[PDB]
Design a protein around this ligand. Structure first.
Ligand SMILES: NC(=O)c1ccc[n+]([C@@H]2O[C@H](COP(=O)([O-])OP(=O)(O)OC[C@H]3O[C@@H](n4cnc5c(N)ncnc54)[C@H](O)[C@@H]3O)[C@@H](O)[C@H]2O)c1
Ligand SMILES: NC(=O)c1ccc[n+]([C@@H]2O[C@H](COP(=O)([O-])OP(=O)(O)OC[C@H]3O[C@@H](n4cnc5c(N)ncnc54)[C@H](O)[C@@H]3O)[C@@H](O)[C@H]2O)c1
Ligand SMILES: Cc1cn([C@H]2C[C@H](O)[C@@H](COP(=O)(O)OP(=O)(O)O)O2)c(=O)[nH]c1=O
Ligand SMILES: Cc1cn([C@H]2C[C@H](O)[C@@H](COP(=O)(O)OP(=O)(O)O)O2)c(=O)[nH]c1=O
Lengths: 346, 346
């Protein structure tokens, strides 16, 4: 029900995947991507589909003058733009404060001015940490053993804290000014086009480059994995059918500890089960994340389609193997940056 | 008295100036450096009497990283009161709230991290949102969740409360991620000497003294938990010197009252008819009832409020504004004029 939408952060991982989704399934919609092209922005993620349906505008979401020019011609804003890596936020929180909070505020004021639709894309990390299933009476199935729309905010890092802060002002702008906004908090995404600084693609590409995979500590931490294609359909459902002012949780019930994920990657790529390095653990590292997506399923009828992790991972490994020119120019620089704060445990 | 050289941000304001006076009179071994921007709310007269070898006033912005670094380099603690504190102003122009409440707190946190010094964040009960009236609660206000506690979910309604809540979140993340030595306090509505005339109680008192009729938003059923600024001061001191690192403490004196009954008591004490006031346009997103359970502070730190008699406290406050008319007479006209731009008798 929208014809001219702005997608911020559309040259990144999750955002570019959403743009591809629109280009393929809703050809009647025009998309204007607003992206600053930081270390994480890549024109290659959109180059093949740029045209009458999709255009790219290079700029900052904190640039009020530019945002005003674009907002005056749109009927909706889908907001993905952000500094998204915890490890980078621990080394230098500056850009997180700027982009995640000030950037969201700038966009909210534009939505208010032109009275248009706004969907805020956020993360499950705003809720903090959860204990491992082995230490819970309900084994992870009981009340409060998973995140729900009623869970309190309790972020652990500069990244999750600035995202949570942005969630708070979006909701305040709805109650105070009647902005037409909705919010989504999603679990860990994986799939094609994810930057190699992130867990899954870092291990896959290190192996392809003849470098040892890296595991933080002993790998006890748990993440709830969801394929980006399912994140895309969830956001589209909320954008077009959601209730104004509501928050929806997106997840596919795919909890796994880092150790088992790395072991699956090694096995699929024909490597020995112990061919990896244990490395310096992350400060304030979150233990377990888990999402209860009952609300979105019940109210909007959304159902994830990529629930077979083994197959999804197999296809992801093949994509990075078939598109080595997409990441090879960044491998040395990313690993060198990590070497400044991480070393092999022994 | 473990801290000998402290910085008090926003010390030229209402609550902050009362805290500086408290330190001057009860902890003579402490030197105080006040950092205040002197906005419409800052007033040098609130500190004049005690300025000298023991208390210094430095005019500046908490977002000025260079100035903050210079002052932090010679301090052993920072007590943070600086902020844009009025909901009504935040609804008219959120800009200064974004700047001061969030960016300002971030700047101070980085300075505390660099020099590894104590940091106490002064916050509000409004970060928790709103509560139903006691007559509409199954436990009449005495049951679980019928009052705010340290476990209550954040759910701010306005630009003011959401920016304050946002600052609370990054303070907690800096503790978990970087080991910053911070504590947080969330307090109920303060009243007493030196409060700006834009606030509820002082506005009604001074309006009567100036020949202007009091103003009540709607029917005045909204409820607030009143505490005398002197008890807020001793509460912050207990948390600063004995509080557990990383913990949040709620400050309150169990004094819930509805706006209507508070205004009537004022009219009565100042010899005015019970109907000598006007009903005016209600506040957008206006919060219903606020209530604080201060058990944690009382039980764990041994703190107890001394001004539990509201009638007596209010009497002394009316007397203060009556004996110090030169302190506010010059601002009366401007404040009421600003209000007239959005408020009309109904
Ligand atoms: N990675 C995940 O698993 C995940 C899971 C849930 C929610 N989220 C959220 O999804 C969104 C997108 O995540 P991602 O993994 O695709 O991130 P990403 O790192 O892959 O891409 C971020 C993108 O935003 C752009 N950007 C950064 N600052 C900008 C600014 N000031 N103005 C304009 N563009 C700017 C970058 O150029 C880049 O293209 C974020 O808001 C993130 O918090 C991420
Ligand atoms: N008034 C209340 O009932 C109340 C209740 C609970 C919590 N609080 C909190 O208590 C603190 C103080 O409240 P208040 O009523 O005394 O406010 P106030 O309006 O009386 O004073 C604010 C002070 O901060 C200064 N200031 C504003 N922006 C600044 C900046 N960028 N740099 C430096 N100084 C700046 C102003 O000049 C002023 O002296 C706030 O953080 C507020 O959120 C207030
Ligand atoms: C980047 C990276 C992450 N990890 C871990 C840390 C996290 O528990 C998990 C995913 O990390 P990451 O991809 O950074 O995502 P997020 O912090 O948002 O969940 O993988 C490793 O073990 N090794 C690595 O090289
Ligand atoms: C300033 C003012 C406030 N009020 C009400 C609104 C609030 O419920 C209450 C206190 O308002 P206020 O002093 O602005 O404090 P806060 O919003 O931080 O609680 O008094 C009036 O009825 N009339 C007025 O003129």
């Amino acid at each position: 029900q929208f014809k001219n939408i702005i997608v911020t952060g559309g040259a990144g991982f999750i955002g570019s995947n959403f743009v591809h989704y629109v280009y393929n399934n809703h050809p009647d919609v025009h998309v204007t991507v607003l992206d600053k092209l930081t270390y994480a922005g890549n024109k290659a993620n959109l180059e093949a589909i740029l045209g009458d349906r999709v255009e790219l505008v290079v700029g900052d979401i904190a640039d009020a003058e530019l945002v005003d020019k674009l907002a005056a011609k749109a009927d909706a804003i889908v907001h993905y733009a952000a500094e998204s890596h915890n490890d980078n936020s621990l080394n230098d929180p500056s850009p997180f404060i700027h982009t995640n909070f000030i950037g969201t505020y700038t966009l909210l004021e534009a939505a208010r001015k032109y009275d248009i639709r706004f969907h805020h894309v956020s993360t499950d990390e705003v809720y903090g940490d959860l204990p491992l299933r082995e230490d819970l009476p309900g084994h992870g199935e009981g009340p409060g053993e998973k995140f729900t729309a009623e869970t309190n905010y309790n972020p652990s890092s500069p990244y999750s804290s600035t995202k949570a802060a942005s969630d708070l002002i979006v909701k305040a702008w709805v109650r105070s000014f009647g902005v037409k906004a909705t919010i989504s908090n999603c679990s860990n995404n994986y799939g094609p086009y994810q930057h190699i600084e992130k867990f899954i693609p870092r291990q896959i590409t290190n192996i392809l480059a003849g470098i040892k995979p890296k595991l933080y500590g002993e790998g006890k931490n748990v993440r709830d994995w969801i394929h980006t294609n399912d994140h895309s359909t969830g956001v589209w459902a909320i954008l077009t059918k959601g209730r104004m002012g509501e928050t929806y949780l997106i997840g596919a019930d795919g909890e796994k500890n880092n150790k088992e994920v790395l072991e699956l990657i090694l096995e699929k790529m024909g490597q020995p089960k112990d061919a990896y390095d244990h490395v310096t653990d992350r400060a304030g590292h979150d233990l377990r994340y888990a999402i209860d997506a009952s609300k979105l399923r019940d109210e909007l009828g959304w159902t994830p389609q990529f629930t077979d992790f083994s197959e999804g991972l197999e296809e992801t490994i093949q994509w990075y193997t078939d598109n080595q020119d997409w990441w090879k120019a960044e491998k040395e620089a990313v690993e060198a940056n990590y070497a400044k704060t991480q070393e092999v445990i022994k």
